[PDB]
Ligand binder design. Structure first.
Ligand SMILES: Nc1nc2c(ncn2[C@@H]2O[C@H](COP(=O)(O)OP(=O)(O)O)[C@@H](O)[C@H]2O)c(=O)[nH]1
Ligand SMILES: [Mg+2]
Lengths: 12, 385
């Protein structure tokens, strides 16, 4: 998931 | 060569025993001998900056095989704050003790704190050894320290003691400068190279969390250390009962990866985990490398008024929040025998009991806060359970 530069996030 | 092992050292010991004279003597003598930036007393006694307000200096010196980041502080207050918040990093410590005065109060206090915060190794440099022409005496001044270091669990019987003079050497009397180098030898030989984050077991502090219908739940955050490879087992430790689970995938910026490593922000997918089985304050960790604890012994520093701390003292029955990694949990404190109130600016041993369990181990740092406003800092000195 859910980020893309540097936030907290994801997927799987 | 080029960029070799980085080791963080520091100088501690009672006041005006020569800690700042040694730091200088080191940058210099070392700068001469092996080449590097040198620095002198007068401008190393300066107590500038801060961050994590601490009066500290910084200097870098090299040896043929290592690069050293050295820390020296003006007064005892700065050391307490630094060692407790962890701002001043030390893989090893140089305990500067004047052969003249001998083991003083702050000296014991630093060996004590040192043990409470994790300082792994302590090397001793018996300074002012030029003011003494005795031989059987500096034989005691050393057996004092041996015994003392042992008092707090430091291998005093094995601790390297170096007789010297951060002055005679510092100036140029090579005869003593030879001690600055012998000391430097122990830094290299007695202080083991610090293990790099990736070498340590896997720990991931959970930030955001969401479910995946067929597979389970993914949790996000930064890898604090270790490496999480797709397919390995992991545990969810904290707040609730620990749970096991396999990592069935890692993702970062929408790209699925085969592994996630320390220093990186990722998403881990937990096979069979329901989103309600995850609480904030929990971590992902290599199975059986860290456990949930609710009670611990800590050394805390209460921020002073001039550091934005509270303007007034606190008493027993004080129940603030202990901020751990991601969330601040509630805990009750038990104060030392016969300690009524804790004044702003004070540092004390504290037994804390949390309302929810958190993954932890000796060395874990945490913040003491009130309404999201940090008023104190601490480090777990001993997990009691
Ligand atoms: N004669 C002599 N003077 C020293 C020696 N080591 C340091 N100095 C003096 O002792 C004092 C210690 O200063 P400093 O390094 O700032 O003390 P610290 O607070 O323990 O770091 C200074 O006044 C120095 O001139 C020594 O071995 N012999
Ligand atoms: Mg000094």
């Amino acid at each position: 998931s859910c980020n893309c530069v540097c936030g907290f996030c994801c997927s799987x | 060569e080029r960029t070799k092992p980085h080791v963080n050292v520091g100088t501690i010991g009672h006041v005006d025993h020569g800690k700042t004279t040694l730091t200088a003597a080191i940058t210099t003598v070392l700068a001469k001998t092996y080449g590097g930036a040198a620095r002198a007393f007068d401008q190393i006694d300066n107590a500038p900056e801060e961050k994590a307000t601490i009066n500290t200096s910084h200097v870098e010196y090299d040896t043929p095989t290592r690069h050293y980041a050295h820390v020296d502080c003006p007064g005892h207050a700065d050391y307490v704050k630094n060692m407790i918040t962890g701002a001043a990093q030390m893989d090893g410590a140089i305990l500067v003790v004047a052969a003249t005065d001998g083991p003083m109060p702050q000296t014991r206090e630093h060996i004590l704190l040192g043990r409470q915060v994790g300082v792994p190794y302590i090397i001793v440099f018996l300074n002012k050894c030029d003011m003494v022409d005795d031989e059987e005496l500096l034989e005691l001044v050393e057996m004092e320290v041996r015994e003392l270091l042992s008092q707090y669990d430091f291998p005093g019987d094995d601790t390297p003691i170096v007789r010297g003079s951060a002055l005679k050497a510092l100036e140029g009397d090579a005869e003593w400068e030879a001690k600055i180098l012998e000391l430097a030898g122990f830094l290299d030989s007695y202080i083991p190279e610090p293990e790099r984050a990736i070498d340590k077991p896997f720990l991931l502090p959970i930030e955001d969390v969401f479910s995946i219908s067929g597979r389970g739940t993914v949790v996000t955050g930064r890898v604090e250390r270790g490496i999480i490879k797709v397919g390995e087992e992991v545990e969810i430790v904290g707040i609730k009962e620990t749970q096991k689970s396999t990592c069935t995938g890692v993702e970062m910026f929408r790209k699925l990866l085969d592994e996630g490593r320390a220093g990186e922000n990722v998403g881990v997918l937990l096979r069979g985990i329901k989103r309600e089985e995850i609480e904030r304050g929990q971590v992902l960790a290599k199975p059986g490398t860290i456990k949930p604890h609710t009670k611990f012994e800590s050394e805390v520093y209460i921020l002073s008024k001039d550091e934005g701390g509270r303007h007034t003292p606190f008493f027993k029955g004080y129940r603030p929040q202990f901020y751990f990694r991601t969330t601040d949990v509630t805990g009750t404190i038990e104060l030392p025998e016969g300690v009524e109130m804790v004044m702003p600016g004070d540092n004390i041993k504290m037994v804390v009991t949390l309302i929810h369990p958190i993954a932890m181990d000796d060395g874990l740092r945490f913040a003491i806060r009130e309404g999201g406003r940090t008023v104190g800092a601490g480090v777990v000195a001993k997990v009691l359970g």
